[PDB]
Design a protein. Structure first.
Lengths: 56, 197, 56
């Protein structure tokens, strides 16, 4: 009792919706990757730097 | 139970984003559901619906839809007077249940065979014991009633139909005149016990 | 059933790719973060060593 266009559009929406969620998660992941990058670099560089200073 | 109703082949398993709901639709709204369910929620997959089973009062149908729409579908289904069950297909649970059913059925019959053979034997033995113990009862009562020696005239009587009057008459005359007025439920000329068989 | 299945399979593929790719990037950025931090603190060490030697 529905035409091909009505359901076809809804199927297209469902798929795009899922792709959009995956895209948003990917963006969140890269932002966090940048945060973890900076966190690890800061922690490591300061820890080693401290060891160097105490050494000398 | 859906165990005998639902098949593995009715569901999309390990789906990324879909959930399957089961809806029991009144017969009068069967065709209505087939159409109406489409508009009960947003983000419904086209032509995914089907009929999973039928009954005389209602039909059982499955629907696959976005996880987040589970709440909306059920609500609108309630609004349209459909009963929607949240059933997550579980191959292991359904099989486990069928195995337990068959195992208990098998064990019940297996025990039954020997059960009843044993009981039939033990009950016969119990009946014989009933006979022996009451023959002793009658023995000692006969001794108590008459004294010694122990040679008494003991008979097992199988009455004739409607003969109980005559039987009482004949046994009364037979023994009453030989002993005393001292001895029914209490006083009978002989030892007498009823065998209920 | 086959239309909904193909659609959800496509949405699953794209979503999975999106998050797996961001996860991979996070891991890569963290390793990069460590190498750059290491290079800086090693340069710092060398310079402090030169000062040390000068001082001795």
């Amino acid at each position: 009792a529905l035409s091909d266009a009505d359901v076809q559009k809804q199927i297209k929406h469902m798929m795009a919706f899922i792709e959009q969620e995956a895209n948003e998660k990917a963006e969140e992941i890269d932002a966090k990757a940048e945060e973890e990058f900076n966190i690890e670099k800061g922690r490591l560089v300061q820890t080693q730097r401290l060891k160097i200073m105490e050494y000398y | 139970s859906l165990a005998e109703i639902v098949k593995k082949d009715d569901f999309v398993l390990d789906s990324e984003y879909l959930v399957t709901l089961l809806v029991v639709v009144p017969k009068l709204n069967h065709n209505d559901w087939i159409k109406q369910y489409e508009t009960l929620a947003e983000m419904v997959v086209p032509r995914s619906s089907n009929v999973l089973s039928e009954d005389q009062d209602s039909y059982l149908c499955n629907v696959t839809l976005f996880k987040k729409a589970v709440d909306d579908f059920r609500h609108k289904a309630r609004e349209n007077k459909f009963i929607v069950r949240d059933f997550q297909y579980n191959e292991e649970e359904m099989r486990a249940d069928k195995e337990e059913m068959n195992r208990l059925s098998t064990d019940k019959k297996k025990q039954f065979g020997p059960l009843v053979r044993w009981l039939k034997v033990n009950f016969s033995e119990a009946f014989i014991a009933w006979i022996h113990i009451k023959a002793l009862r009658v023995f000692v009562e006969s001794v108590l009633r008459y004294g010694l020696p122990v040679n008494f005239q003991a008979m097992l009587l199988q009455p004739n139909k409607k003969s109980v009057k005559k039987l009482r008459e004949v046994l009364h005359e037979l023994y009453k005149h030989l002993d005393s007025s001292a001895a029914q439920q209490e006083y009978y000329p002989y030892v007498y016990y009823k065998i209920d068989c | 059933q086959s239309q909904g299945i193909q659609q959800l399979l496509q949405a699953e593929k794209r979503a999975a790719e999106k998050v797996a790719d961001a996860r991979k990037r996070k891991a890569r950025r963290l390793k990069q973060a460590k190498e750059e931090a290491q290079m800086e603190v090693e340069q710092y060490r060398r310079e402090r060593e030169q000062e040390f030697q000068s001082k001795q």
